[PDB]
Amino acid sequence: SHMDTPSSPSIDQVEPYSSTAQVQFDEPEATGGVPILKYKAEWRAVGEEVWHSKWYDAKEASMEGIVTIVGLKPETTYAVRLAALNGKGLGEISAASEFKTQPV
Ligand code: NA
Numbered sequence: 001s002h003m004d005t006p007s008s009p010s011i012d013q014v015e016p017y018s019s020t021a022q023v024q025f026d027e028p029e030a031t032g033g034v035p036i037l038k039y040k041a042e043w044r045a046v047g048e049e050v051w052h053s054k055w056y057d058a059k060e061a062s063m064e065g066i067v068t069i070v071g072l073k074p075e076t077t078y079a080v081r082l083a084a085l086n087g088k089g090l091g092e093i094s095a096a097s098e099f100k101t102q103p104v
Helices: 058-066
Strands: 010-016 021-026 038-045 054-056 065-068 077-086 099-101
Touching: 010 077, 010 099, 021 077, 038 058, 038 065, 054 058, 054 065, 058 065
Parallel strands: none
Antiparallel strands: 010 021, 021 065, 038 054, 038 077, 077 099
């Protein structure tokens, strides 16, 4: 009788530059029963406790196949994960993917 939140997106690869990175991902296998509305990316520098997060429109993300994370520091290793938002709320977070920003 009730829809749930989406299953997890999958991160394929991350293409990092100096202060930004392109996160390549797959849509959830299951929407949960109602449509994906937004994506949330969360990232943090490995070793640190604080997570940074940003919302992304579902339409452009799923069409481009990417979300772009910003405000990164050069030469630094990060963990990133993704979750889909539907009408019920936030779904399962993806497995974390680790990348390193390039040197300036
Ligand atoms: Na894939």
